[PDB]
Amino acid sequence: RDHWIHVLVPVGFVFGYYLDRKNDEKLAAFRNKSLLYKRELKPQEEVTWK
Amino acid sequence: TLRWQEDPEPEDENLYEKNPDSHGYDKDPAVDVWNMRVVFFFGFSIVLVLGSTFVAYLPDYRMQEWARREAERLVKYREAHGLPLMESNCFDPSKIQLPED
Amino acid sequence: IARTFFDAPEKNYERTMAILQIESEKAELRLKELEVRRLMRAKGDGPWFQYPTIDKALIDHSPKATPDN
Amino acid sequence: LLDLIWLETILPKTISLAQMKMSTTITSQKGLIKLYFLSFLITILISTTLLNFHE
Amino acid sequence: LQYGPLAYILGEKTTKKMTENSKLITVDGNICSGKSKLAKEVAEKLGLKHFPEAGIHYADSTTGDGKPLPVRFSGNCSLEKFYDDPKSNDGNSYRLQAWLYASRLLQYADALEHLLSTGQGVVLERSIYSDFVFLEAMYRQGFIRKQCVDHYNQVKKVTVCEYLPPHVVIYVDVPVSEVQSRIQKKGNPHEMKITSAYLQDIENVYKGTFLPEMSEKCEVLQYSAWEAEDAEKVVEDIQYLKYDKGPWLDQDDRKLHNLRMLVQDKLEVLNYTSIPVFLPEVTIGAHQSDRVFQEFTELPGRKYRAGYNEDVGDKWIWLK
Amino acid sequence: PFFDVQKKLGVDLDHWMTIQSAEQPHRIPARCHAFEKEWIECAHGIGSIRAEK
Amino acid sequence: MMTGRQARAPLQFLPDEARSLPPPKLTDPRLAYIGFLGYCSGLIDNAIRRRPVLSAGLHRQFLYITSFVFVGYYLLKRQDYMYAVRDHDMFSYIKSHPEDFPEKDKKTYREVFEEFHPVR
Amino acid sequence: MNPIILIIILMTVMLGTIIVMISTHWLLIWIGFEMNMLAIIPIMMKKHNPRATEASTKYFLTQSTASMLLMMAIIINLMFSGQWTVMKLFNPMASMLMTMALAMKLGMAPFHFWVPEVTQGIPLSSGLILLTWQKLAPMSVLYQILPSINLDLILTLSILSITIGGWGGLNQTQLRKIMAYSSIAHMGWMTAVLLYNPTMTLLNLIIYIIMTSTMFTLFMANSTTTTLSLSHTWNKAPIMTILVLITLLSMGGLPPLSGFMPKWMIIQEMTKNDSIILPTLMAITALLNLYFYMRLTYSTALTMFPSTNNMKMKWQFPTTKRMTLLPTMTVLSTMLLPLTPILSILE
Amino acid sequence: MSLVYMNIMMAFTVSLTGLLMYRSHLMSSLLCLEGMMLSLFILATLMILNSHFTLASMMPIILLVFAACEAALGLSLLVMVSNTYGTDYVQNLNLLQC
Amino acid sequence: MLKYIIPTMMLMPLTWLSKNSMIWINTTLHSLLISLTSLLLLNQFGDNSLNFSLTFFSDSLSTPLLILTMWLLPLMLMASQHHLSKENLARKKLFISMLILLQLFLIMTFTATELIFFYIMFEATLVPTLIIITRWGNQTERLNAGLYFLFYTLAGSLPLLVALIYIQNTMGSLNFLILQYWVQPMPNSWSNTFMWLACMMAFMVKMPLYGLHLWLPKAHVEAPIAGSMVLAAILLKLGGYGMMRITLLLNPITDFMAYPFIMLSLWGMIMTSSICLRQTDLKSLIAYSSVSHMALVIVAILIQTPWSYMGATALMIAHGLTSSMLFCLANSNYERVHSRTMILARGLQTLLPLMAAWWLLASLTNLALPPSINLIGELFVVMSTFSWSNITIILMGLNMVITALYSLYMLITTQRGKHTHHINNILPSFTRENALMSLHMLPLLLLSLNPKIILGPLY
Amino acid sequence: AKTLLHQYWDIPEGTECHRKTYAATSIGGASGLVVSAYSVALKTPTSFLEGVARTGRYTFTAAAIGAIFGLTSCISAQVREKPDDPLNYLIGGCAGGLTLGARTRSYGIGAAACAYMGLTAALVKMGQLEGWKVFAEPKV
Amino acid sequence: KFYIQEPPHGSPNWLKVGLTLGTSAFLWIYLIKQHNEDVLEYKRRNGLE
Numbered sequence A: 001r002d003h004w005i006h007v008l009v010p011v012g013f014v015f016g017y018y019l020d021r022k023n024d025e026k027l028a029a030f031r032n033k034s035l036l037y038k039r040e041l042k043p044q045e046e047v048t049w050k
Numbered sequence B: 001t002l003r004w005q006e007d008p009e010p011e012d013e014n015l016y017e018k019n020p021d022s023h024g025y026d027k028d029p030a031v032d033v034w035n036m037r038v039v040f041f042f043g044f045s046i047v048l049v050l051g052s053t054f055v056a057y058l059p060d061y062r063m064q065e066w067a068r069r070e071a072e073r074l075v076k077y078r079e080a081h082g083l084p085l086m087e088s089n090c091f092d093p094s095k096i097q098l099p100e101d
Numbered sequence C: 001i002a003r004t005f006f007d008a009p010e011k012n013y014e015r016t017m018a019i020l021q022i023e024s025e026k027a028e029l030r031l032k033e034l035e036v037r038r039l040m041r042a043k044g045d046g047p048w049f050q051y052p053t054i055d056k057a058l059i060d061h062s063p064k065a066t067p068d069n
Numbered sequence D: 001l002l003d004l005i006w007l008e009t010i011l012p013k014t015i016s017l018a019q020m021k022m023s024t025t026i027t028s029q030k031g032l033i034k035l036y037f038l039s040f041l042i043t044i045l046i047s048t049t050l051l052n053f054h055e
Numbered sequence E: 001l002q003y004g005p006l007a008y009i010l011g012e013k014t015t016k017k018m019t020e021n022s023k024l025i026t027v028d029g030n031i032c033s034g035k036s037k038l039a040k041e042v043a044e045k046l047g048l049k050h051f052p053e054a055g056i057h058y059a060d061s062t063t064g065d066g067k068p069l070p071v072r073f074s075g076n077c078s079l080e081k082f083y084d085d086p087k088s089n090d091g092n093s094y095r096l097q098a099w100l101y102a103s104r105l106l107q108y109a110d111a112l113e114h115l116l117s118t119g120q121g122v123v124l125e126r127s128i129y130s131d132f133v134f135l136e137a138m139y140r141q142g143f144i145r146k147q148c149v150d151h152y153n154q155v156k157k158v159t160v161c162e163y164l165p166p167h168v169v170i171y172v173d174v175p176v177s178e179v180q181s182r183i184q185k186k187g188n189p190h191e192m193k194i195t196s197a198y199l200q201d202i203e204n205v206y207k208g209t210f211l212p213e214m215s216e217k218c219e220v221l222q223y224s225a226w227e228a229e230d231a232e233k234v235v236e237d238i239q240y241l242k243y244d245k246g247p248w249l250d251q252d253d254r255k256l257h258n259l260r261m262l263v264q265d266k267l268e269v270l271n272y273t274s275i276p277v278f279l280p281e282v283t284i285g286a287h288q289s290d291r292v293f294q295e296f297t298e299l300p301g302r303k304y305r306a307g308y309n310e311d312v313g314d315k316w317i318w319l320k
Numbered sequence F: 001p002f003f004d005v006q007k008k009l010g011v012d013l014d015h016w017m018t019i020q021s022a023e024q025p026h027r028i029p030a031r032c033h034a035f036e037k038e039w040i041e042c043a044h045g046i047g048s049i050r051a052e053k
Numbered sequence G: 001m002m003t004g005r006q007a008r009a010p011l012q013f014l015p016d017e018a019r020s021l022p023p024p025k026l027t028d029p030r031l032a033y034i035g036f037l038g039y040c041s042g043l044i045d046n047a048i049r050r051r052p053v054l055s056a057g058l059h060r061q062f063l064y065i066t067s068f069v070f071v072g073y074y075l076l077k078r079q080d081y082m083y084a085v086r087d088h089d090m091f092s093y094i095k096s097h098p099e100d101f102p103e104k105d106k107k108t109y110r111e112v113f114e115e116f117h118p119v120r
Numbered sequence H: 001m002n003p004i005i006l007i008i009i010l011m012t013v014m015l016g017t018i019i020v021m022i023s024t025h026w027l028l029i030w031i032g033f034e035m036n037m038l039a040i041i042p043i044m045m046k047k048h049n050p051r052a053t054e055a056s057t058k059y060f061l062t063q064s065t066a067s068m069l070l071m072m073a074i075i076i077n078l079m080f081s082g083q084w085t086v087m088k089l090f091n092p093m094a095s096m097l098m099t100m101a102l103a104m105k106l107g108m109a110p111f112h113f114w115v116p117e118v119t120q121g122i123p124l125s126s127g128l129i130l131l132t133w134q135k136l137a138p139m140s141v142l143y144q145i146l147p148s149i150n151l152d153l154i155l156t157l158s159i160l161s162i163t164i165g166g167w168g169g170l171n172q173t174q175l176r177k178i179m180a181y182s183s184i185a186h187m188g189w190m191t192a193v194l195l196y197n198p199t200m201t202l203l204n205l206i207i208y209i210i211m212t213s214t215m216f217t218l219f220m221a222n223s224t225t226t227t228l229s230l231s232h233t234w235n236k237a238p239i240m241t242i243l244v245l246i247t248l249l250s251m252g253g254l255p256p257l258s259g260f261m262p263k264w265m266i267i268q269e270m271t272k273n274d275s276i277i278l279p280t281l282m283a284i285t286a287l288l289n290l291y292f293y294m295r296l297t298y299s300t301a302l303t304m305f306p307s308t309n310n311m312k313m314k315w316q317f318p319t320t321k322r323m324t325l326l327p328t329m330t331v332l333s334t335m336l337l338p339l340t341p342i343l344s345i346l347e
Numbered sequence I: 001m002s003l004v005y006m007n008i009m010m011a012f013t014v015s016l017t018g019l020l021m022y023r024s025h026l027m028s029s030l031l032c033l034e035g036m037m038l039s040l041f042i043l044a045t046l047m048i049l050n051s052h053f054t055l056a057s058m059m060p061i062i063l064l065v066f067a068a069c070e071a072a073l074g075l076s077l078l079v080m081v082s083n084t085y086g087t088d089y090v091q092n093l094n095l096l097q098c
Numbered sequence J: 001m002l003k004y005i006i007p008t009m010m011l012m013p014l015t016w017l018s019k020n021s022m023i024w025i026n027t028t029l030h031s032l033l034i035s036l037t038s039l040l041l042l043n044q045f046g047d048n049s050l051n052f053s054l055t056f057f058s059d060s061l062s063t064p065l066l067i068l069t070m071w072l073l074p075l076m077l078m079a080s081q082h083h084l085s086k087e088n089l090a091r092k093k094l095f096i097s098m099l100i101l102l103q104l105f106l107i108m109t110f111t112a113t114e115l116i117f118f119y120i121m122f123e124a125t126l127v128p129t130l131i132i133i134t135r136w137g138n139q140t141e142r143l144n145a146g147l148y149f150l151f152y153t154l155a156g157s158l159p160l161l162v163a164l165i166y167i168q169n170t171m172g173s174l175n176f177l178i179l180q181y182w183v184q185p186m187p188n189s190w191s192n193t194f195m196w197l198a199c200m201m202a203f204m205v206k207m208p209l210y211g212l213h214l215w216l217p218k219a220h221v222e223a224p225i226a227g228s229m230v231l232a233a234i235l236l237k238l239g240g241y242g243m244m245r246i247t248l249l250l251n252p253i254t255d256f257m258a259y260p261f262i263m264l265s266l267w268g269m270i271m272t273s274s275i276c277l278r279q280t281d282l283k284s285l286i287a288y289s290s291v292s293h294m295a296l297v298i299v300a301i302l303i304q305t306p307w308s309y310m311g312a313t314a315l316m317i318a319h320g321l322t323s324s325m326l327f328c329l330a331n332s333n334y335e336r337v338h339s340r341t342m343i344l345a346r347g348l349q350t351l352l353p354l355m356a357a358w359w360l361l362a363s364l365t366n367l368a369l370p371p372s373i374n375l376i377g378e379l380f381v382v383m384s385t386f387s388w389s390n391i392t393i394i395l396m397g398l399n400m401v402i403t404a405l406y407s408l409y410m411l412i413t414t415q416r417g418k419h420t421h422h423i424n425n426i427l428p429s430f431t432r433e434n435a436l437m438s439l440h441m442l443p444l445l446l447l448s449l450n451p452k453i454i455l456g457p458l459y
Numbered sequence K: 001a002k003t004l005l006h007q008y009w010d011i012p013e014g015t016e017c018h019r020k021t022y023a024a025t026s027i028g029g030a031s032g033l034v035v036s037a038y039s040v041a042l043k044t045p046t047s048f049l050e051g052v053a054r055t056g057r058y059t060f061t062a063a064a065i066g067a068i069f070g071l072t073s074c075i076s077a078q079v080r081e082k083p084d085d086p087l088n089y090l091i092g093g094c095a096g097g098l099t100l101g102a103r104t105r106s107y108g109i110g111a112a113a114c115a116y117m118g119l120t121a122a123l124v125k126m127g128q129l130e131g132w133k134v135f136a137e138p139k140v
Numbered sequence L: 001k002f003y004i005q006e007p008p009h010g011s012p013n014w015l016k017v018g019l020t021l022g023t024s025a026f027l028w029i030y031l032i033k034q035h036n037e038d039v040l041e042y043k044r045r046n047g048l049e
């Protein structure tokens, strides 16, 4: 491919979104524990949100 | 006896003589055409009209329309049971320990 | 647009709750740090601010040439 | 009157001229060592007697 | 590189390598004294070698491809335009003289490095102790002003105090009329404009102030023009001299080690050439300086160091 | 940066002289040997501030 | 101020208690930043000696990256060891002295008095 | 200078500094200080110039006065205390005499009357050795006796040092006097925080040493000792101008550079003790230091001064000098902010 | 404390005021420096001899020793001035001011 | 916020690894991709801010400023790509790298959850603007423009940082998601007075306040126009972000203390409008108009009513866009005539009709023509200041005359009248210039249809 | 010099005039002796008479500064009857600034000195009122 | 043959680059071995296996 310099920023954005999606995993201290948004975990499910 | 020997100051370079079709980007015509196409595609055709379509159909900014609907419910409650529309007490006046006077 | 891009309100809500919890814990620990440092420097009974002194292993307990020592 | 002189005078120019005068007076030393050690002596005499730093 | 304090600690003494052959020779005189082969004569039968005289483009020949560089990159001066109109307003004469002086400094540094590295005597031509006399002629025609001579004295005073005079110095005495006739029969059209006062003042400052300082710190043999073609008498004068004059005897291994450490770093030698004394003849404009520097950057073999240019045919740069 | 290498290498350089109540040649006591012993042994390891207080 | 803890046993970079702590992972962002620092240092050597900046001397760049990563890993180990020592001494002293640090009863907002200043 | 004799001299001065570092005896402290003196003295006389002799005479006289004051403080402490352990002192007057001795040894104001001439009269490597290696042993001694240090005396000396260093640096064209007054300002910034948290003093000392060594290495690389030659460096190399700009921006105190790392946290260890106006005054004098730094940066890098025709010869030879660890020290002097908590290794 | 202690420390500060106020000669200041060290040595030796501290008896003489190890250096810092200037006056020693 | 910082730090090698003739095209294309990507920040709720992580958050306030910043970078790249054609390629990449670093520090400034982080990168922004101002200018006074710009701003904030550190010793955390619930009222004392002064004066200088505005005209009549646009349009907004993030902690002492600040701002905005009425340079006139607009924003946030906050944010964004495009107009004129005099080049409508149309649209949007967002913000601030007190409207009314009077006059002598005879190098419209002008103008008109995205954090 | 400042602050402000004025005059005299001793130390006087003239000049100037400052503070606090108000000290600072301008024979120096040591006197007064510390003792 | 002389850095010194490569490999191997020793000593010292 002779257009390697034009796929730098989309690769960076993909990496940044992957890093952010890994970042909310460490912030699961109060998942399905808030006094206003709590609900029973449905069958065929494991988490309320990824 | 001339001090600090320097080249004469260059004149204002003009762009419409060597290239009458130039769009003010560079000297190479292909570079000018590619730069013009890139900015006119990714600035107008890509950010303006698609950004306008995105912000026109943005999903209910700050739940503002939702702020109507629940309110459309709420008065529909309290106009059917004789309750006042809104009360001067934001919270329950029986659930507050008044300080001594 | 909400399905493809936007974060769910539940996810952002619980993320805010976790952030609030972590930063509140850090603030309380910082306040305890300041109070503990103040008390330790004022009293000197803690492992911090243990300023050096003369070791007692250098004292010679052998009998000397003079009985008065 | 206001924008070009007086506001230009009160904050920046007075500070600049004050630092000008102070830095001129500080580093106009002659390089003599007798004066330097006399300065050390009067410094020691001020610190010991006037300030009373051994209290 | 190749030499340093560790080598001197390891045992590299320069006085081991200088035998009785290691005599530094320079031959200097008038414009067309006939010494141009004579110094080379001392090269070809004494087991020595003789670099040519430090010209405008000697540094362009000793570094890079060896092809002399254009005027814009190196020098920005012209000897021929100096010969046509030496009273030009831009001070081309002083620029040419200063470039020649820096060339002589680099030439003497290279010769001293060769002497201290191989122990071989080197024959030179018009060494750095014998260039100012030309500028004295430049002062006695009205060609340059007082401030430029002051700048030259400052430069020479700050760059010559770290060096040593040569072993012997050979002078060829030619009369002004004979060398003038020689110049007129040279045939080059750009050197038909030398005045007689030029050579007269050259010889006057040559015999007046240069001899009573060079005769003490080194050995000088005053030859003559007709006997300058006699190589055997000159070489017999060379072999049967007593080496007792000058500072060449009270120089131990550490002093020559310091000399070699100073010499082999060329920017240390050329550091004091461009002192920040502001002169209208020498100062180059900032825009012109940037343009000339960018032009010299794109020349082949000059964008990077001497062995890191892919455009000249260097391999294994990624492993170097 | 009091790099106490005297305890790291276990070599005694100047701990044998630094205190009046140390080991002396031919076992000669100083004029205040007992007071030095009391002041060291009372104020050992508890910190300078507590030792002064 | 931790010198008392470094009083009995000196000149120890990593004492015996430092081995009981979780070491930093190789994918730590600080280690990546220090590796970037080493790469920038190699680029500066390629720049200041008039060499090509991105191809000349890959061995020098790899040596710089490795040395920077090594010293950064050991310095980060010492850093987290010292911070763990700080927090452990903190909790030990806060178990040890409860008389000088009592408890607080967090009151509700239904009875604590606050003064409201109107903005107008 | 003989390389073996020079190596022996360097081993002597490092041995004296190590002796001051590791000894638990006052006499050995003074012996290490005397060895430090006697080994740094011939370093300044490597070139055998009258300026070097004047600087050596001034340095020797000032450090001898400091050494005799240190001995009198030691003898007073001995007579009132009966021992020799390097710990808190048992007399305020001994604390006075030792503080004056260490201030004279460091060059802190008003005893700053010897640092600029001594730095100016000696070459760049000797100035590096002075302004870096002579600021380690007195800092260790002040680290050892900080229980007995009077607060008002050290704070007054610190604020006088910063103010005098800034006002001195405002009016000097020579590079070495600029370095000396900047060193006085950094000394005051470093010794103002000594009584509150000596780890901040050690951190600021380490950062100041790294930055000053970086700058002296750049000056040695460019072989420049004047402002005009420093401006003339733009034609020889642009990279040298980039590094001098970023380094002299770093010592100014600007974020996100490393020089903002110590000084800011100095305030972080002085607002905890409820000292508010003193870090503000020292920040104002740091702005003065930044002002003369900004003038110097305007001279060297941001404006290209006119050059001469000789420098074209210097375009044909690369820099063959030995830059000792220049990129590492430049990187550590510029981009150490995101590794700020690493100061916890100094506990 | 005592009386001879007062006399010795007053001699030290008298010699200090002698050194700290120059009189246009370097070697006279060197003599005052060696006088300050004489007071230091005398005070230390008397303090030890009063307190019966035997093992510290090395410290005075060694102190004395080290002083000579710098004092000759001061003499070695004199003739070099005499190798540049004709005399050794301190008011001539003002070249380092620019 | 890692999905926009990593694109910037990854575009940094892209402008370092680009070819010798495709730097501008690649940088403009990829910055426009980042500009489209930045629209995802508008996932806003009426109660909770979009808190991305521990040290990054963005409510309804900072999101329009971020969108303006990374929409502003390509406009700067086009506006600064003419005069740098003769500049060396390495220095061209240095200039583009400086602009990229300035954008990165700006986006990290507006989303910093901790106030210490916000301060640290808010004056990490100081280095690239200083470098650009001092190096790539066109006059001698740029050297002086590097002093008055710097030694003002730092002198306002080296107290402020100490005050911030004091809050770290008082509250225990400077996080903004915590301090909305841990905030205590400020009592009336001299110590709280000086804390208020220290927390206020840095952004008072950065607005600038009148009396402290001397750094603004001296740093605008000489800058390269990339620097001029970033200074006028987005760099002055750091003061507004400082107000709307700091004024939570400074209640209720702000109400009975900000009287002389409001007096200074009102009478100085009157003075600077009058100074605009008698100017000779385009750049100085636009800079003094910016001083007037920021004094109005100062009053708007100092009276602290919700309507005032809406008007302050709307006026900030609209003034940033308008001042950037006005500086583009002045740069086109200075490009064509090689001077900054207003009276020199007159009657350009006879020669350049489309630039005359852009001049007319700029002048109309400058004097708050409805229904543009400039009029929306200015009207909301007008009503809020009338709610603060009645007599203020008089102190507004004269200004609203004067802010029209120069705004057309600056047009008229530059566009209407007999053209100068001895000027003949007036080239026609380059497509790059008019494309930049339309890219400035069209969002300013488009935001009038849907203003609710730029109406602050409390719409 | 630790007793001059305390004796200055041992008397209630605006109550008695001459003792406060003489205390401020003594503080000014000590400062003048210090600065004149430094001035004759670093800068060599041409003669003994010129040196003692310079010493007397600095002593007189600083004594007048202190005396007028203390006096103006005393009558300001007596007239306004407000002991806990720093505006009296600001007025005294401008009085000292006018004194400095008179003894140095300048006017812009007088106005700058008005502003500068008026602000300094105010900072001293709220430092006394709010209990600020120039040299804070170590706590943590 | 471009340059008139032989530059000292015009030829790849194989010993120097070999020593650099060996030192880098040794440092990396020591780093991973130390990391492994630390991680299993951590799991041993707390029993969290």
Ligand SMILES: CCCCCCCCCCCCCCCCCC(=O)OC[C@H](COP(=O)([O-])OCC[N+](C)(C)C)OC(=O)CCCCCCCCCCCCCCCCC
Binding pocket: B047, B048, B049, B051, B052, B053, B055, B056, B057, B058, J063, J064, J065, J067, J068, J071, J317, J443, J446, J447, J449, J450, J453, J454
């Ligand atoms: C944002 C802060 C930073 C600023 C710089 C931003 C840079 C990036 C810019 C990206 C692109 C632009 C984004 C913003 C776009 C705003 C516009 C938009 O989309 O609005 C959505 C709004 C959405 O409308 P809405 O909000 O009413 O719709 C509700 C939403 N739904 C449909 C889901 C229920 O669009 C309109 O209002 C369009 C209305 C119709 C079109 C216009 C018709 C009339 C035209 C004029 C006729 C003549 C009149 C008389 C003239 C007289 C002479 C003057």
Ligand SMILES: CCCCCCCCCCCCCCCCCC(=O)OC[C@H](COP(=O)([O-])OCC[N+](C)(C)C)OC(=O)CCCCCCCCCCCCCCCCC
Binding pocket: D015, H274, H275, H276, H277, H280, H284, H287, J152, J155, J156, J159, J160, J162, J163, J166, J191, J192, J194, J195, J197, J198, J201, J205, K123, K130, K131, K132
């Ligand atoms: C642009 C140039 C001008 C800039 C002006 C900036 C604003 C002016 C005021 C800034 C003061 C410095 C920061 C103070 C922060 C205090 C925070 C706090 O909580 O304070 C309470 C503390 C209170 O003390 P405390 O909190 O330690 O005491 C405990 C609490 N009580 C009181 C109950 C016992 O205030 C102070 O300690 C003093 C504050 C005033 C400081 C006065 C000295 C500085 C004067 C201004 C200098 C400005 C720069 C001039 C030069 C510019 C460059 C040329």
Ligand SMILES: Nc1ncnc2c1ncn2[C@@H]1O[C@H](COP(=O)(O)O)[C@@H](O)[C@H]1O
Binding pocket: E030, E031, E032, E033, E036, E053, E097, E100, E131, E134, E135
């Ligand atoms: N410094 C100088 N000034 C003027 N002319 C010089 C200088 N150095 C060398 N030359 C000329 O160089 C030539 C020497 O070459 P040759 O004729 O081979 O001896 C003569 O024409 C000299 O006049």
